[PDB]
């Protein structure tokens, strides 16, 4: 497939598709994504970096915005600590084979001209819109603090300074990105990835114990957490194991099953695995064992790349 | 009278009186006030500078914060324009005989460490408190903008950087000043002046046509505006002419009245003028004529000091 279709694969939406086509024609184009520094880099992060890799192969210069300043506003703790996790996250993204520029929010986000642009935008932005765009990003908060309505304007301003033609992120970012398309002279093309269900089956994949697979997890940690994850028989919707199979595994794939009891099923594609699981021919136990093993192989290079340092 | 009593004269409140006494004992102490640049410097401003003069005579080093950055957040227009009016306001305050330091908000209010302190405070400050403290400062606004809740935190942060022991301002500032006493390590002593009724009799003195007396107004402008001002017979409460007599005039004072019709009444103090006016012995027309003339004399040096430049 071409560039457009490769980019579109496994995304929830593109705002907008035509605008992306116009961008693709350009000799030089850029794509950025912002990550608040996270102690654990899990498959949720990986899925987005994989999309940044696709853009990179389509001729896009990639910029990773390490939103330390944004995390600080999102009550992630102190700058110094947050900055340290941002250093760690940078090495993890680098181990993922992605080559890109890494810019800290606090690098330019404390400059006179930047801060001034923040206040200007704050003049244009209503409190209503600001809080609205933070619904899928904040915890609602008993009594919301001023910092919460500053956050979306800081992100929007970051997108402006990075100067990227494309803005990549999760679907929780879509309200801030729509704000960005309204507040900035250059309408940024928005590519949003799907939200990855946590292993618990209760919402998105987060840093809560056993709810995630860290790209640097050890084989035993991967197996254990895959084993005790939400995965009802025949159930595909909300099945974090099926999602992992869909977005991370390579096909054709051979699932190991005890002879006579199965045995050993060769799946040509995710769509085959899907119907096989929905028809209950593939039992959760076998699906888990296969995903655990494939994941170990897939994440191995990343994990060994970090260990070698 | 001593220092404390001179300072207290003609103020609505001091937060708190004891804290002020402790400050007075110090060999070195400072007092600041913030003004959003205004096209017209009227008696409202003058009344506050007069209080800054009292503090100056009590051993206080005075700082005038020209809140250009704050005006910008209060939708007063563009920085460049606002800055120009701030230059004008500085020369007017200087013509008032006040010697002090003049610091623009945008001078330090765009520095890295400053902006960072803004975000920290925004983490501590709830949207509720912020909007609440802006009720007597903003116009409520149909759909409030983010800039409105940033404003009070910028003022509070300005007070912190100026490093003043005392914070002077009008009673509309009291909620922001209470915020300041809560947010900052050093509890600033707050001295609030009364709100001067506009000539219209409808609220505070503002830049609305004929509602103000500019310290640089010409004698004919002063007379005209005093003549057509709200001033019911025998009515002292809400009477802007009586307030002007109370806060700006020197006593004993001799009011010129046509012989036989009056004539010529010598008032020993404001309290005498008060009862005389309330008992209807002093007619509004005569009161106005006297205030107009006294005001012309009082404001003359200021007006001629600006003309000489």
UniProtKB/Swiss-Prot annotation, chains A, B:
Pfam families in the cross-refs: tRNA-synt_1b
Chief place where the protein resides: cytoplasm
Protein residues bound to ATP: 207
Chain sites annotated for binding L-tyrosine: 32, 36, 173
Catalytic activities: tRNA(Tyr) + L-tyrosine + ATP = L-tyrosyl-tRNA(Tyr) + AMP + diphosphate + H(+)
Documented EC number(s): 6.1.1.1
One GO molecular-function entry: ATP binding
Stretches of the chain forming a coiled coil according to its record: none
Region (Tyrosine): 151-158
Intervals of motif 'KMSKS' region: 204-208
Chain positions of site Interaction with t-RNA: 143
Subunit field text: Homodimer.
Protein name in the entry: Tyrosine--tRNA ligase
Organism for this UniProt entry: Methanocaldococcus jannaschii (strain ATCC 43067 / DSM 2661 / JAL-1 / JCM 10045 / NBRC 100440) (Methanococcus jannaschii)
Annotated gene: tyrS
């Amino acid at each position: 497939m071409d560039e457009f279709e490769m980019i579109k694969r496994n995304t929830s939406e593109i705002i907008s598709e035509e605008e992306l086509r116009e961008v693709l024609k350009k000799d030089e184009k850029s794509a950025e994504i912002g990550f608040e520094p996270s102690g654990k880099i899990h498959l949720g992060h990986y899925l987005q970096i994989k999309k940044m890799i696709d853009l990179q192969n389509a001729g896009f210069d990639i910029i990773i915005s390490l939103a330390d300043l944004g995390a600080y506003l999102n009550q992630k703790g102190e700058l110094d600590e947050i900055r340290k996790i941002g250093d760690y996250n940078k090495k993890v993204f680098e181990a993922m084979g992605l080559k890109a520029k890494y810019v800290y929010g606090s690098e330019f986000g404390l400059d006179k001209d930047y801060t001034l642009n923040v206040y200007r935008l704050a003049l244009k932005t209503t409190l209503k819109r600001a809080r609205r765009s933070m619904e899928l990003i904040a915890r609602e908060d008993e009594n919301p603090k001023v910092a919460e309505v500053i956050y979306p304007i800081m992100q929007v301003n970051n997108i402006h300074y990075v100067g990227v033609d494309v803005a990549v992120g999760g679907m929780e970012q879509r309200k801030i990105h729509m704000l960005a398309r309204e507040l900035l002279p250059k309408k940024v093309v928005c590519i949003h990835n799907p939200v990855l269900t946590g292993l618990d089956g209760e919402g998105k994949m987060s840093s809560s114990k056993g709810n995630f697979i860290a790209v640097d997890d050890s084989p035993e940690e991967i197996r254990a957490k895959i084993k005790k994850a939400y995965c009802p028989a025949g159930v595909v919707e909300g099945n974090p194991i099926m999602e992992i199979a869909k977005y991370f595994l390579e096909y054709p794939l051979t699932i190991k099953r005890p002879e006579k009891f199965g045995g050993d099923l060769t799946v040509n594609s995710y769509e085959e695995l899907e119907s096989l699981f929905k028809n209950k021919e593939l039992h959760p136990m076998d699906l888990k064992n296969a995903v655990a093993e494939e994941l170990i192989k897939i994440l191995e290079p990343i994990r060994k790349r970090l260990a070698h340092h």
